Amino acid sequence: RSRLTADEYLKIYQAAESSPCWLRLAMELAVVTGQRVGDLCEMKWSDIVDGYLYVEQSKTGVKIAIPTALHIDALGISMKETLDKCKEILGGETIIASTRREPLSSGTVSRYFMRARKASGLSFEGDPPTFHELRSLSARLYEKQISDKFAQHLLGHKWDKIEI
Amino acid sequence: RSRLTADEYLKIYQAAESSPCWLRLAMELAVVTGQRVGDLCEMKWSDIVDGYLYVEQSKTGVKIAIPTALHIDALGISMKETLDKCKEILGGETIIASTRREPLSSGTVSRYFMRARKASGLSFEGDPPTFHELRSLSARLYEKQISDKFAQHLLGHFRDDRGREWDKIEI
Amino acid sequence: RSRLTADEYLKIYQAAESSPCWLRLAMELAVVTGQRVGDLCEMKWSDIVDGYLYVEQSKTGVKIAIPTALHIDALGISMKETLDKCKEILGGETIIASTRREPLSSGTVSRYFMRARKASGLSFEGDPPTFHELRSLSARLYEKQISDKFAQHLLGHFRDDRGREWDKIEI
Amino acid sequence: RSRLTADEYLKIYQAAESSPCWLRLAMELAVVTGQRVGDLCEMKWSDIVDGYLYVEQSKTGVKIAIPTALHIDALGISMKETLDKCKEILGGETIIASTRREPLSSGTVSRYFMRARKASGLSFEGDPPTFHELRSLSARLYEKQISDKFAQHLLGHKWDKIEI
Amino acid sequence: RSRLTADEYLKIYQAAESSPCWLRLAMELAVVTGQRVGDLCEMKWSDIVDGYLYVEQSKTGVKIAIPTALHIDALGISMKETLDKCKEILGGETIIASTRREPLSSGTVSRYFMRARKASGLSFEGDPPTFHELRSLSARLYEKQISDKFAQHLLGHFRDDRGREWDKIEI
Amino acid sequence: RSRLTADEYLKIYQAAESSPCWLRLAMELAVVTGQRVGDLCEMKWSDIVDGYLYVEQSKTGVKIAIPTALHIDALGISMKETLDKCKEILGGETIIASTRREPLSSGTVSRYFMRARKASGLSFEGDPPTFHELRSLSARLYEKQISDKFAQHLLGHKWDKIEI
């Protein structure tokens, strides 16, 4: 299906204005960490140790340690800043959490992103991009900003520490 | 005049996507060093000696030695990384330089920042923040991360060289 | 500082005969739009949509939509005519531009205006009026021609676009 | 006889400092409207209707409607501004009027212009220009500023509305 | 802000050894004429007539005729000698000009002066003196050499030409 | 022996900070007048008449009149300014004088300059320059700034008035 460009992300992010607060935060976390929505929903505060967010991908078993100093230039996302916002605004045991501080599921996150997407009025060639497409956007952005190698390493394609 | 928060800095930073390459770098350098724009524009590579960026403030005459190991945690800004980028991307005699490696003036930096600010679409209570507001942001962020004493020290509110005395910034 | 009257504006305008082509046009645009020089220098052709010149004041953040049908009767200044001249004679990305189609800075505009002012040979009580005085002139002329409310509106003292709200100027 | 250049007009205008107030106003009106002195003296406020000054030339019968929005760049003359000054300063039934608010004749206007001309100290090759030469100056100035066609149309050489 | 003494002027002058050729000349012209930097940058060769440099101050409108025979004894500055050097070394339409004979702006002059000031290594009580401090120095030196009346006259605190009246400076 | 460059003069001048006040003043006077130390020590206030310092060189008999308006650009030395400082700070019958206002000898001046030189930490190829080398520095500086002819005229190599 259709991909998601940076400009399109900005339009959806804007429409997410009237969405629950965690949606915009989940979008930021998805692009800056490049992790699958299933893993994003599993992330907990105890997973962060000494400036590194440890992630064992549920689907692949790939274990990586993501530096919280990461940032995506094109969208102006600072991983630390996003994490600070998740801590203060959401305040759950899970980094990403509902308004009632409960863990979120992939279906719920994807569903709300879809609503924000419709609210933006964007048109796409073929099936509109889902929340999952934020992972490809992350790779494409990190490739230009750093390197295709870095993008691949971060996505889990190769605890394996992520550096740069 | 309105202040600029860390989240607002990031919106403007994003909006700077279509600005000259030096804008984002000047923004980062302003927040991590806390120096006035006039002084940012004066900084040269020869001012860095043994991991320290020597700055004599143009307006006040205050002489400080800034450790290049500094980081602004809230925004993920590393002074060393930023300087590396300035060297690799701008490559002028001055740390901040145009695409043609020429020095920049305070007016030009402020002007481009103002344009990126408008592009972000942010709304402000009162007059919008200018590039100068990045110095106040630096202070508030450093006050939290390190201390009110550190911030006042960095802002300019003793490695004695060949005559002149410099205030060494620590931690 | 001294004010500038309509008759004095014309003496300086005459004196601008030997000034760059953009000076007279910048003078006309300053009086008919009432915008600060910093904003005049920022205006671009892309800011004009369906007979309206959109302006976000750099200093205040005030967003207004100026109808291009405006006229300053006292001096025979037509905004549309002036814009046509700017397009045909200057032809830059910015409405006001140099002979090389480059953007102009507030300092340059003020400097050339100051020179034309001296060339006119006018005498003033107190410090002579600067290019900024054209904004006050705009207000006084509009206050008489239309209303004190209109002038304050134009000076910056609701076409809602993609997010941002604009104050539409009427009559 | 000799012509009158823009710089020469400025010198005479300067010397007109000590001349009756209507002289400078008549000079401005002469250059911006390009009309003969005989017609200038006949102009009345009732001749202006909806931003147009209607003039039927006495000598030729040519009927033209001059837009009050006209202006001469070289000399910084705004027709509306000059008319506003004539209204406030002179205040007669005729646009151009004496100090005692009475109509002026061509001879009087020409005579005072001649005195201002002498007072300026200018030297000319051949007979000095008279007030009549302001009409040629008008044409030469409007030609450069707009076009020879416009100059001719305004002078009455071709109610005929004047536009541009 | 700190004042600048005659001895300090010489230290900065020495330090200007590696500055553009126009810096030392602009410094000399500032002290011997006592004019604001904005006006120094505006001066042209056509302004000198029969041994007098005609200056209409941009800010105040004050019109003075400065005799080119002036000297600043305390520093050995001769106005005629300085002007000769400006003509021979700079050779622009403006008395003070860049290496490419282009006019200079107040900001550029101040900026280079500030750099020479730092290079001298002088220490100051309070904010260091800027190029503007050369005008106060001119006044204090002239007050001693000639009189308080002369200084106030020169600073701008009657050869009547074609309309405009000029204040002739004497002795 | 080794020569003295302008940069070296600046370093020694800086080290002269802790030297008697007359040393720095003697250094300035030596470079701006280009006279031998023996003559510098003989200079008196009565030798200055109408902006000219009259000097009859002891060794050669050469009589020259040095304009007090002279200045050395490279070192920022104004002869008048230096003389003003000698008058106010030293206040002796001799232009150059000791702390107790007594005349100085060549040996004393040379000796203190040597101490300031050592204090600067400079290294030289061959024998370090003595106070006498300030005379050569003067010539080399005046040559570039004005002309070799001027340098020679000032040094006494050709009352003979010095001009320019």
Side-chain angles (χ1 to χ4, degrees), chain B residues 2-79 81-92 94-124 126-142 145-147 150-152:
Chain B
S2 185
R3 52 172 264 172
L4 187 72
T5 68
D7 198 64
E8 288 171 339
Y9 162 103
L10 290 174
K11 304 302 186 185
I12 297 175
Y13 190 96
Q14 181 286 307
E17 180 69 9
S18 53
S19 301
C21 47
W22 58 257
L23 185 54
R24 283 182 169 155
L25 296 168
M27 283 172 67
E28 290 179 350
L29 213 63
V31 177
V32 79
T33 71
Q35 300 312 298
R36 296 185 182 79
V37 65
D39 297 319
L40 290 175
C41 293
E42 290 299 307
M43 300 176 173
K44 299 189 315 304
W45 298 109
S46 45
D47 297 339
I48 298 174
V49 178
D50 300 322
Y52 279 83
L53 168 61
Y54 289 77
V55 172
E56 176 176 347
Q57 305 187 341
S58 299
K59 181 189 175 296
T60 64
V62 173
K63 286 175 289 305
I64 60 179
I66 311 175
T68 57
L70 280 179
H71 280 83
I72 276 285
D73 298 330
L75 294 169
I77 297 169
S78 168
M79 189 167 161
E81 304 271 277
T82 296
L83 289 172
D84 283 359
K85 286 141 63 177
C86 288
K87 192 70 173 177
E88 306 171 343
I89 310 305
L90 309 176
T94 47
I95 297 176
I96 292 307
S98 70
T99 322
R100 309 178 76 252
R101 308 181 191 256
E102 322 159 287
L104 294 161
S105 68
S106 304
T108 299
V109 176
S110 298
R111 196 170 307 130
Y112 278 90
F113 175 86
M114 170 278 291
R115 294 170 186 172
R117 188 191 69 214
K118 288 180 182 181
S120 75
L122 291 173
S123 305
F124 299 97
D127 292 0
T130 66
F131 191 91
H132 175 260
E133 272 48 75
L134 292 175
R135 180 165 151 89
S136 301
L137 177 56
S138 178
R140 297 189 305 267
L141 295 183
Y142 271 134
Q145 180 181 311
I146 308 179
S147 54
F150 176 89
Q152 292 309 283

Side-chain angles (χ1 to χ4, degrees), chain C residues 45-66:
Chain C
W45 298 109
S46 45
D47 297 339
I48 298 174
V49 178
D50 300 322
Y52 279 83
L53 168 61
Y54 289 77
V55 172
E56 176 176 347
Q57 305 187 341
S58 299
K59 181 189 175 296
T60 64
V62 173
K63 286 175 289 305
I64 60 179
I66 311 175

Side-chain angles (χ1 to χ4, degrees), chain E residues 33-79 81-91:
Chain E
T33 71
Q35 300 312 298
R36 296 185 182 79
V37 65
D39 297 319
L40 290 175
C41 293
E42 290 299 307
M43 300 176 173
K44 299 189 315 304
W45 298 109
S46 45
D47 297 339
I48 298 174
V49 178
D50 300 322
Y52 279 83
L53 168 61
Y54 289 77
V55 172
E56 176 176 347
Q57 305 187 341
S58 299
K59 181 189 175 296
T60 64
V62 173
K63 286 175 289 305
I64 60 179
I66 311 175
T68 57
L70 280 179
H71 280 83
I72 276 285
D73 298 330
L75 294 169
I77 297 169
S78 168
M79 189 167 161
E81 304 271 277
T82 296
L83 289 172
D84 283 359
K85 286 141 63 177
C86 288
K87 192 70 173 177
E88 306 171 343
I89 310 305
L90 309 176

Side-chain angles (χ1 to χ4, degrees), chain D residues 1-92 94-124 126-147 149-164:
Chain D
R1 55 192 174 285
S2 178
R3 60 177 181 119
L4 187 66
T5 74
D7 288 331
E8 292 175 336
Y9 166 104
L10 295 165
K11 296 303 191 309
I12 297 171
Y13 188 96
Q14 181 177 1
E17 167 70 78
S18 45
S19 294
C21 278
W22 56 259
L23 183 56
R24 278 175 169 168
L25 298 179
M27 288 175 66
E28 293 177 4
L29 201 62
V31 173
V32 75
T33 68
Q35 300 311 301
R36 301 180 184 80
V37 63
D39 292 318
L40 292 173
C41 290
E42 288 291 312
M43 295 170 180
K44 284 195 278 56
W45 294 112
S46 50
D47 291 338
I48 300 173
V49 179
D50 298 320
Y52 279 84
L53 172 60
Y54 293 81
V55 176
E56 177 178 342
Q57 309 189 337
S58 304
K59 180 183 179 297
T60 62
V62 167
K63 294 185 282 302
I64 52 183
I66 308 175
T68 60
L70 280 184
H71 57 99
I72 274 287
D73 296 338
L75 296 176
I77 301 164
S78 161
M79 183 169 166
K80 189 62 168 63
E81 201 262 350
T82 291
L83 286 173
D84 287 342
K85 286 197 296 178
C86 288
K87 192 68 176 175
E88 302 172 2
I89 305 179
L90 310 182
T94 48
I95 295 182
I96 281 306
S98 73
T99 306
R100 321 195 86 57
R101 301 187 166 98
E102 289 157 9
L104 293 162
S105 67
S106 303
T108 300
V109 176
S110 301
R111 182 176 309 113
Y112 277 87
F113 176 86
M114 171 277 291
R115 293 176 192 172
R117 186 192 69 212
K118 290 184 179 174
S120 70
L122 293 176
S123 306
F124 305 89
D127 295 354
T130 66
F131 190 92
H132 294 311
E133 272 58 81
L134 293 167
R135 179 165 155 94
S136 281
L137 177 54
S138 180
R140 285 182 276 117
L141 291 180
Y142 270 123
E143 173 179 28
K144 296 192 193 73
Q145 183 182 322
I146 309 183
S147 68
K149 308 303 298 181
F150 181 91
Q152 293 310 295
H153 193 211
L154 183 64
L155 289 188
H157 299 157
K158 252 58 178 168
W159 290 101
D160 182 15
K161 176 169 302 182
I162 308 292
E163 294 162 342
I164 302 182

Side-chain angles (χ1 to χ4, degrees), chain F residues 74-92 94-124 126-140:
Chain F
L75 296 176
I77 301 164
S78 161
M79 183 169 166
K80 189 62 168 63
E81 201 262 350
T82 291
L83 286 173
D84 287 342
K85 286 197 296 178
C86 288
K87 192 68 176 175
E88 302 172 2
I89 305 179
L90 310 182
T94 48
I95 295 182
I96 281 306
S98 73
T99 306
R100 321 195 86 57
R101 301 187 166 98
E102 289 157 9
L104 293 162
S105 67
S106 303
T108 300
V109 176
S110 301
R111 182 176 309 113
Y112 277 87
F113 176 86
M114 171 277 291
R115 293 176 192 172
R117 186 192 69 212
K118 290 184 179 174
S120 70
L122 293 176
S123 306
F124 305 89
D127 295 354
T130 66
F131 190 92
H132 294 311
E133 272 58 81
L134 293 167
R135 179 165 155 94
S136 281
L137 177 54
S138 180
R140 285 182 276 117

Side-chain angles (χ1 to χ4, degrees), chain C residues 21-22 25-26 28-29 43-48 78-79 81-92 94-99 101:
Chain C
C21 47
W22 58 257
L25 296 168
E28 290 179 350
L29 213 63
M43 300 176 173
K44 299 189 315 304
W45 298 109
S46 45
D47 297 339
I48 298 174
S78 168
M79 189 167 161
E81 304 271 277
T82 296
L83 289 172
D84 283 359
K85 286 141 63 177
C86 288
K87 192 70 173 177
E88 306 171 343
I89 310 305
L90 309 176
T94 47
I95 297 176
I96 292 307
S98 70
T99 322
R101 308 181 191 256

Side-chain angles (χ1 to χ4, degrees), chain E residues 3-79 81-92 94-124 126-142 145-147 150-153:
Chain E
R3 52 172 264 172
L4 187 72
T5 68
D7 198 64
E8 288 171 339
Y9 162 103
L10 290 174
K11 304 302 186 185
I12 297 175
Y13 190 96
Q14 181 286 307
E17 180 69 9
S18 53
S19 301
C21 47
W22 58 257
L23 185 54
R24 283 182 169 155
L25 296 168
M27 283 172 67
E28 290 179 350
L29 213 63
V31 177
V32 79
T33 71
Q35 300 312 298
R36 296 185 182 79
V37 65
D39 297 319
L40 290 175
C41 293
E42 290 299 307
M43 300 176 173
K44 299 189 315 304
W45 298 109
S46 45
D47 297 339
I48 298 174
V49 178
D50 300 322
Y52 279 83
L53 168 61
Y54 289 77
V55 172
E56 176 176 347
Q57 305 187 341
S58 299
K59 181 189 175 296
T60 64
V62 173
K63 286 175 289 305
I64 60 179
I66 311 175
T68 57
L70 280 179
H71 280 83
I72 276 285
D73 298 330
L75 294 169
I77 297 169
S78 168
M79 189 167 161
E81 304 271 277
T82 296
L83 289 172
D84 283 359
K85 286 141 63 177
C86 288
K87 192 70 173 177
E88 306 171 343
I89 310 305
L90 309 176
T94 47
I95 297 176
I96 292 307
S98 70
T99 322
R100 309 178 76 252
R101 308 181 191 256
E102 322 159 287
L104 294 162
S105 68
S106 304
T108 299
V109 176
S110 298
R111 196 170 307 130
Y112 278 90
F113 175 86
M114 170 278 291
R115 294 170 186 172
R117 188 191 69 214
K118 288 180 182 181
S120 75
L122 291 173
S123 305
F124 299 97
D127 292 0
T130 66
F131 191 91
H132 175 260
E133 272 48 75
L134 292 175
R135 180 165 151 89
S136 301
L137 177 56
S138 178
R140 297 189 305 267
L141 295 183
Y142 271 134
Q145 180 181 311
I146 308 179
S147 54
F150 176 89
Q152 292 309 283
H153 240 72

